[model samples]
Target: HCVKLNDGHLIPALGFGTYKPKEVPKSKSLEAACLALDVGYRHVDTAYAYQVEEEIGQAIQSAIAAGVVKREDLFITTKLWCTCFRPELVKPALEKSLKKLQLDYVDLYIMHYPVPMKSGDNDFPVNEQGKSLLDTVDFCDTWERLEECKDAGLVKSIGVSNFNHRQLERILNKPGLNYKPVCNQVECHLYLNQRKLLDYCESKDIVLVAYGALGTQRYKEWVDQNSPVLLNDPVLCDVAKKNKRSPALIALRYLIQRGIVPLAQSFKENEMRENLQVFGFQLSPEDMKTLDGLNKNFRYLPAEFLVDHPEYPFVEEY
Candidate 1:
């Protein structure tokens, strides 16, 4: 199933997210992506920060040439990095991504982060004094330019990522805004349900895309190891046994039942196919309730240093 975009594009309900602790070899990533296409995945998500755009592009082209998928049949998504948040730099940044991807247009382009950091720099925390990386540009000005990307036919749809309610409201209130954002991508899982944000997006007709639907186990290298594990919870184990599925599958199904698109990543062929099998079965209402009760307000990647920054959007409660 796909959620209809404001411009009438349908994004697949399940997408493959590609982010590795170490840089993924281009050949391996491409091979995995081609395997994913052969297994019936329609959505591929990537970002500039991940530094794997070229490999993803190659895989996509290979799939198209081999008749595994048509260009129109696939939905490709990429994000604009925080450093390139200046209105003047938005189009150029997108052009760089497009050139690297070997595509003239993208299905969906999102503002990677609401907080604008220094340009030409990838590190979030520099050794400099009292200056965080998020002091570069105003997000609203950047958003206006993103709207221009859609108007100029550079991308089929536009949206924001890592934005909370207050930050989203700021964009919604901007005048002369021709396009409403179609989706808000954020950290969501059985442990961190984010009900408030999900409800707000639902009311506004904006879809929610979950990045950490499987509890961020793979993200722990960049984060602290002391973080609680959602996969090990007894509730998920019991549910998995009852459903005759893996804990990861149950985690993905929980998000789908709530109308949120979940992105699952894995390099193994069997795991990729297993991830897609989530759509083959449905979770009953009782199953959903049991999963919903597992929320513990756990967040895997808080990016804690941003708390002191002025534009740090999500409230303490979040």
Candidate 2:
């Protein structure tokens, strides 16, 4: 079950998301990525801010050297970071990712977030008052830069991440939107199923690709410490038992059946294989309903740091 982008490229429905935890060292990702390919994951999702592109790139090159897979057979998705939101800096941002990934082009390039940070030498520009320095450039202007990159064939498709309904409308309604974002990547899982956002995106023929689909481990920097665990939900476990599968697998299949491409990140080989095997099982209609009922509208990564920004898209009811 692959989703066809507006640009006419196919992205495998379930992808290996490479957003390793902050505590997980970058070098660990290299080994995990190679194993992911070995287990048959064609779609790999990552970001420039993730800071492990070079390691991932090295893994891909090694796979090619070992005759494991060809570059064309894979779909690599990376994003432009907040600091690079300036239109003129967009290309350089993508070039940086390309340089790290050691690739000529990426399958899809996304605007990492709607809120841009003040340009600075620090990865996250901060103000004297200790708040994040917010950039004034419009995200649509950055989108235009991505369009230019697409036209130049440096990226196959362009999209957005962490944008809300109103934010998405801004881009769609932009005067010369040369390319509508093919996908909206968000923090979606059973608890925060994003039914409303998913419906909105579908209405426009834009795919809603879910990140943090299995919920998250205490990403204390972004998520609240008391955040609930999705994989351990009794409802999910009940469904998992019925299907004779893991709760994580059940959570992924839930999203897929809902027509949202789920992104699962796992360093464990068995876990990676299990996630990829989600397609083999089908959630019953009743179970899908039950899973849908579990939506408490909780977001694991609300990005509270940027909540005060004018372009902070998460302000509205998504």
Candidate 3:
């Protein structure tokens, strides 16, 4: 299962997310990513913010060595950290990520968010008091800079993440825009189904890649633990039993059926193996309608930590 980008490249329908939080050991990410490639995940998504570039590369190298796949067969996507959102730093930041991953170019390069932060040594680049040092560089200008990367052949496709329809329109309406974003990656799941956004992107021929597809119920730093559980929902569990698949997998299959790309991040072998089984079964139209009605318009990483910034994305309705 794959989708063709506007830039004329194919992205795997199911991608392995390599986001390792501070609490999770880096080795956990490396081991899981290695197993994912071996199990036939050709797409791997990571970011400079995730602090797992080198680890992601190690996993890919191991897979290459073990003869599971070649680097050219993989679709690798990474983001431009908020701290490096200045147009001048776009190319250099991608270069930095390339060096860390020991790669020459990436399949897709994305603007992690609409908000830009002040420059500093740490990738987070927060102040001593722990607030982000926000910058006001126009993201449209940054898009043109990324177009330069595309021209230079450093990135095959360029896109955005965590952007609303209004922000996406900013690029679309730019006076002399050269390239359009091939996709918009966001935190999406059964609870926050993003129906409106999905329709909007689909209308524009842009792919909407979903992160936190099973919902972010356990990330204490980004999500409230008491948040809704996706895998254990009575509705999802019942559907899963009927299909003889895990509820988590049912959730994933729902996305694929809707033309949304899902990134399933799990280090457990059985879990990774089972996630791919989403291709083995079909969700009926009735099942699709049931899942479609489950949207609560919830958000996990609402960028609450940076609400003070003028460009906070959650301030508007998608």
Local distance difference test values of all predictions, in order: 0.85, 0.89, 0.88
Q: Per-candidate TM vs. native?
A: 0.93, 0.96, 0.95
TM-score attained by model 3: 0.95
Alpha carbon deviation, residue 50, candidate 1 (Å): 0.6
| Candidate 2 pairs with clashing backbones | none
- List model 2 lDDT by residue over 1-318, tens digit each: 698887788999999989887899888999999999999999999998888999999999999999989999999999998888989999988998999999999999999889999775576777788788887898988999999999988999999999999999999999988999999999899989999999999999888999988786555633653556776578889999999999998999989987888888889999998898999989989999999999988877888778878988777898
- Tell me the deviation in Å of residue 91 in model 3: 0.3
Worst 10 residues of 1 by lDDT: 216-225
Question: Stretches of candidate 1 above 4 Å error?
Answer: 121-125, 129-131, 218-227
Tens digit per residue, CA lDDT, model 3, 1-318: 899888788999999888776899998988888888878889999999899999998888888888878889999999998888888899999999999888899999999998888876677667689887789899998899899999999999999999999999999989999999999999989998999899999998889999999885565633655555776588988888998988898899999988889989888889889898888999999998999888888787797656778778877889
lDDT of 1 by residue, 1-318 (tens): 887776677899999987754755667877878888888898999888888899889999988888878999989999998778878889999999999999999999999878877776564645467556556577889989988998888899999998888888888888777788899999999998988899999988889999978775566633665665787778889988998999899999999888899998888989999998998888788888999999988787786666666677566454
Higher-ranked by lDDT: 1 or 3: 3
Could you tally the backbone clashes for each prediction? 1, 0, 0
* Candidate ranking (TM-score, best to worst): 2, 3, 1
